[PDB]
């Protein structure tokens, strides 16, 4: 069920969706975040064809309210430059194609220093 990611303080992390796409389909990808201690972080869209242009459809202000950088979002991938407790929790990726697909993957990001 969960893709578990163990992270260290002030290390970066990357969540990589096991992404597979069909040429010429329009896709929208969303990332949602359920903090440990719901919120759509971001939504992007593009026609699938590095050289892939995309449009940023929506973005959340959650991390900005905390004076922290929101994750960077690219097709298939979520990046956090510096780990801190407010980035820990559950991330859900959902990508929807104009061919009718909806794909989900869920990540659990936890702090390495808390064993068991």
């Amino acid at each position, epitope marked *: 069920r969960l893709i578990e990611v163990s992270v260290e303080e*002030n290390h970066p992390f990357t969540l990589r969706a096991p992404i597979q796409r069909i040429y010429g389909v329009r896709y929208t990808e969303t990332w949602s975040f359920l903090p440990s201690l719901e919120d759509q972080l971001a939504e992007i869209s593009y026609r699938f064809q590095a050289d892939q242009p995309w449009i940023v459809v929506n973005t959340s202000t959650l991390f900005d309210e905390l004076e922290l950088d929101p994750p*960077e979002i690219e097709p298939g991938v979520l990046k956090v*430059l510096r780990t801190e407790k407010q980035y820990l929790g559950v991330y859900i990726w959902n990508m929807r194609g104009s061919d009718g697909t909806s794909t989900y993957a869920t990540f659990l990001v936890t702090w390495k220093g808390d064993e068991k």
Partner: antibody
Amino acid sequence: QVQLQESGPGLVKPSQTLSLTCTVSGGSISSNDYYWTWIRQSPGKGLEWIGFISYNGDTYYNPSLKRRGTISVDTSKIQFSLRLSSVTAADTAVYYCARVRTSSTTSYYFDYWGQGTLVTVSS
Amino acid sequence: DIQMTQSPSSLSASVGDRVTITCRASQGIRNYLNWYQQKPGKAPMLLIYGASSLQNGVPSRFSGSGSGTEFTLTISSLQPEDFATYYCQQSYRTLTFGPGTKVDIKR
């Protein structure tokens, strides 16, 4: 100790892609103890972080470069490189490669630096 | 982005003086603050990390303090070789540098 050497063109035409290579000696690129970064310096805009790469190849970028920068690593030759696309005169600068350390109580810092390479964007 | 500011822009001091340079972060950055020394025609060189940890091989006359938004670099017994531009840099959000403080030597 670890040493870094940049190499690349001095002159690049506007709209072309700046390409630079940093070669690492006295160490290797194989541990999440270190990240490998590009930084630049221009009289006007001071020092600017461009981005860095981990040993596994994960990249993280300054959003200010508008995803025009690509950092890649070739751990075999203990090298890493920078590609900056669609260059303008505003990209004229001294480009430096450096090693990055981090810790739970300090976060990132740049502990060893290459000597810098001046890249002039001009028609 | 976090705006790092420094004071003074430049100073002139005599050999043997004690000089302090100030660095301010636009928001709290804990102690994620580094100091770099840049001599003419050289790359910046790390002096202090974590606001107060002296890098190995850096002379003990360099000292850093601060946490939060205000940081200080003190050079306790200024030397001719300390002619340089000194820069602060934050590692709490997208990495940013201050604009540098130029230290000139009076003789």
